[PDB]
Homo-oligomer: 49 residues x 2
């Protein structure tokens, strides 16, 4: 096992904080808060032109 960084409280790829609640795409972890933040940030699909 030398690829995926698991850890007990997975460190938030965003917050840099060790959290046990969130998701994991590849080997990383977006904390559940950021995980919702993202959905909330992406709400700008159209451009400003």
């Amino acid at each position: 096992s030398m690829d995926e960084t698991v850890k007990l409280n997975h460190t938030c790829v965003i917050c840099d904080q060790e959290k046990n609640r969130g998701i994991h795409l590849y080997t990383k972890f977006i904390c559940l808060d950021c995980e919702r933040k993202v959905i909330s940030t992406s709400t700008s699909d159209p451009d400003y032109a």
Copy 2:
């Protein structure tokens, strides 16, 4: 300016790839693909008990 890592193609906090399309919460960047991936992964709110 010594806090936020901008860069031209913001590196995906997930893919480790330099992408100009995606979001940014704090100082990081989830590529737009991962940004959708997350929403898709979080669809497991209830527990397996």
